[PDB]
Every structure is written in structure tokens, then in C-alpha cells.
């Protein structure tokens, strides 16, 4: 699965 702390600027619950 993706690591949300690879780039914290990416919010995976957003278009």
C-alpha cells in the first residue's frame, strides 16, 4: 500500500 509519509502534501482522500 502507499506510504502517506512519502509525501505528506498528498491527501489520499482528495481529488
Amino acid at each position, epitope marked *: *500500500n*502507499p*506510504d502517506p*509519509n*512519502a*509525501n*505528506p*502534501n*498528498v*491527501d*489520499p*482522500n*482528495a*481529488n
Partner: antibody
Amino acid sequence: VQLVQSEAEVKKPGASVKVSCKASGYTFTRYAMHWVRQAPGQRLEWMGWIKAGNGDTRYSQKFQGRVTITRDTSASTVYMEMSSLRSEDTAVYYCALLTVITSDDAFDIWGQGTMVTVSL
Amino acid sequence: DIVMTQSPDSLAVSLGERATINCKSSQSVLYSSNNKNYLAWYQQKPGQPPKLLVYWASTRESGVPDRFSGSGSGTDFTLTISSLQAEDVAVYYCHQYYSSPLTFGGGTKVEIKR
């Protein structure tokens, strides 16, 4: 939003460099600032990031030994420090707000690079 | 790490023609739970920093000409310039933000015939 980086530098091998990145146009503490390097004729390489809010950092296993990323919220500025410089570290060094994807907006700002040359 | 491999390494087409750039990731960057591909495309011109074109593999960045489009999923991705314009000469990079360390492709150089 603008990101303005420190002036171009030259350093002797084994020395250290500290590159500035001043932000403007947005609330400084909301996003993380990354450092990316581009060696001549070689691919962009990610170095690390820092959360401009709480100061937390992550580094690539390349640069973990020799790189330190800090920030000053009052000055709205991020810093990158490389120690034990080698001739292979000659490159352009970028700070960037990489892929800020949120429900409200989606944006990506880079600084103008900072050339550092490691040479005798 | 996730290796990003681009093809071709360079392309040349006449003005108004279609240019296609392929990018392949060494691991899938699709997350089944949200159906999102953690991939982005950048444009870089000499002496300047990269500029974001596409994110989530297929969502154009704001302010980017609509002739730019991203496509693909999993490990196979495509950037399309439907009608190449004079200003589009540059090097193009894919980028993954699925896993640490963040990584970039080797770049595709797009040239204009005239």
C-alpha cells in the same frame, strides 16, 4: 506562491553547505518542504522533506548520514545542510512543495535551483 | 525503490503533431482502496525547475493546456501532447509518490521539427 533559494556556491571537498529556501504567498506551516537534487545528465533525486508546521523530517537512505533539513517559521524559511561534500555532490539543489493535493486545491511550487560545485 | 523507466528517451515531431511518452514503474502505484495511481508528470526546460503537468496519473494541473493529458494505471502510464506546440519543447519526467524514497524517471526529450 513563490520560493526563493540561496545564491550559488562553491565548496572544497569534505566541507559543508547550507542552502536557503524562503517561502511566500501561503501559510508557511501548512505544508512540507522537500529537497531534490539534479546532477548533470543524471535523473532528479529526492533527498528529504520537513513539515513546516511541527518540524518533523524524513530523509532518503542516500543522504540520511550527511543531510540535515531545518526550518524557521518566523522567517518562513527552510534550510538544507550537506556535510562531507564530494565531487559527485556537484548539482543543482531544489526546494519544492511537491504535489500538494488537497480537497480544497492542488498545487506544486519549486524554487529556482541553487548550484553548488564541489571542487578543489 | 520504485524505478521509473521512460520511453522513448527522445522524440521529435512537427508542430501540431501528437507526442506520446511512456512511463513504467517497477512496482504498482495503484492503491485498490481508493482507485488512485500515485503518479505525476513534470515538464522541465533548461535552466528552470520542473513544472507539474498531471497528478493522480490522469488529473491535469490547473493552468496547464488541455492538449496535455495523462493516462494509465498500475505500472504503465502515458503522457500525451495532442497537438505539439512551440512552447512544449522540453524534457518530461514521470514521478511516483507511492513509496519512500520518492523517485523520478530518466526523462524524455521532446524536440520540434520545422
